[model samples]
Target: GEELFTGVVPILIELDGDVNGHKFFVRGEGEGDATIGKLSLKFIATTGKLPVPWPTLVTTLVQAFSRYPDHDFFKSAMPEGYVQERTIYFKCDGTYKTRAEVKFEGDTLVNRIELKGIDFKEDGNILGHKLEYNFNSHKVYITADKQNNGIKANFTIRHNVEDGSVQLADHYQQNTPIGDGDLPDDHYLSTQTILSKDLNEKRDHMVLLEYVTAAGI
Candidate 1:
């Protein structure tokens, strides 16, 4: 039997030549079952150096999905809800450090995601200056203007390194579809196939099989 559902369980990313810098895991059930899927990441600081803040880490994690257009799983998977939105929270150092939300529209093939959080640096100053890492967060919006043709995505990140004030923003647009195509026909396994085959063979077997004997006998 053909598999009804397919999904990715473990996904990892390496940055700056370090495996522990940033990594992500994906767990999801598809098609026949009723379960919400999830993608999660863990950031580990091995060198004890001031690492990227949790909010920034999460923002990067969320944006990773943008590469789905080039993957086979996302291309074949059918999204249940035509329109949907969700928010995720990340906790670190005894505070709700980072939060994000994503909205999707099927008809327009658009997606918008936003992230907000505090800076990662704890020090108030470095080299005769008050060092503050704060920002307005980030937002990423993507749209598939043409069906199976291409996609356009926008990204923004904000932050301030002084007095905990910062703002970083950026956006990107790309046209990508590895191997997208139209949906399959329903008759692939429907009764129509049997009827067509019988007709082609000039066999009255359908009527004979239905009645099993002469009519009005």
Candidate 2:
């Protein structure tokens, strides 16, 4: 059965991905214009295993969603602070579930994430059990129970609408004596669909079914 929510209008964005390979399902849904509301991202594995490492996978997903902020339509249509909220949800291997919600209000970032179904009972391995980063407080709390203590750090995310690219860098860690690189993630990119006439024809079928319940048909 299809899931429907009141006042939640769903919009679609065409993405670049493989037809016969593992891919992400990026969807948009919200009140008024779906694109104008807070953007929430969810990752569901289409296969038994992830195509990429966790860090790479998450970065790519962020890059995928970053396309919106980098789009000409989003830039012109939305006002300053138009994106009220941003969130990320992760689901994997039938047991892991995690959620990270971050609020953005001009240079200030408030964030946290809860990772369930992962226990840090072993040692020597840096398995991330829970991670919370708060820029306002200038602290990064990483918890991996029984193995090691927590630590701190951070980044800047830039988007290129022209080439459909996103750059995420950890400026806080890169320029130090113990320097490391915080490069961009542009392994893949997708363009939004321009063929609405074709898309509308298919949507017509779904709309017809939606009307049946509303009209008690």
Candidate 3:
């Protein structure tokens, strides 16, 4: 079997707010920007089939939140506990991407979250890391790369609201890699591989994530 998926996808989790009346957030870079975290998925070549569709990738993250909703810098919203906003960014191949923002209301045990799926077409600016939406140009600039100041924009995408000219950034690649090789002290890495019975191939998948304080852009 040939390689199914080989590229890496960077996940940026940004949190803001206070915990237990004490200030808490991810510490990274930038001034007054202490709510950004970084992680990446490095895939190895395998003869097995690994399912990495957009929805599956999204679910993988949702499961992470549900499994480990509370941590040193990450707190689950509970009634009489705390409330915070979590925004996750996923940079796929080309200029396609997804941003899921969830507000944790810990008052209730069951936390409710709002997920927004975003994608674009056509390339715009790649040199700029800051995202600035221009109404006149109908363009959205974003960077999926994780840097000292947080996730900076290395790609530009056009905003086409209506026509079918839009294409979703789905599936990873065999040659593309996102972000750098830097890992945080509190980072978590998984060396897991799965095999598909029908496909008769083995696939490898791993994700490295960490929590930092005061890291924002």
Name the candidate, 1 or 3, with the larger TM-score value.
Answer: 1
Backbone clashes for every candidate come to 13, 0, 25
Runs with alpha carbons beyond 4 Å of true place in candidate 3:
1-71, 76-185, 189-217
Model 1 lDDT, full chain set: 0.26
Please report how far candidate 3 places residue 184 from its true position, in Å: 9.9
lDDT of each: 0.26, 0.22, 0.24
Model 3, range 1-217, lDDT digits (tens) per residue? 0010112212233322221122222211111111232223232323232222212232223112211212221222111222222232334322222333422222112222222323321241211112222111112122332333222322222322233233232222111112222211232212122212223324443333333222122
Which lDDT tens digits does candidate 1 get at residues 156-188? 444345555443433333333233332221111
| Window of ten residues with lowest summed lDDT in model 3 | 1-10
Runs with alpha carbons beyond 4 Å of true place in candidate 1: 1-8, 16-37, 45-58, 62-139, 145-148, 160-162, 173-175, 180-217
Candidate 2 lDDT over 1-217, as tens digits, reads 0011112333322122221233433222212222322333223333324322233222222111122233121122112211111122222211223333322223222222333323222221112212111111112211111221111113322222223333232222111111111122222222221111124332211110010000000
| Residue 150 error, candidate 3, Å | 12
RMSD of each: 23.3, 19.7, 18.5
Overall local distance difference test of candidate 2: 0.22
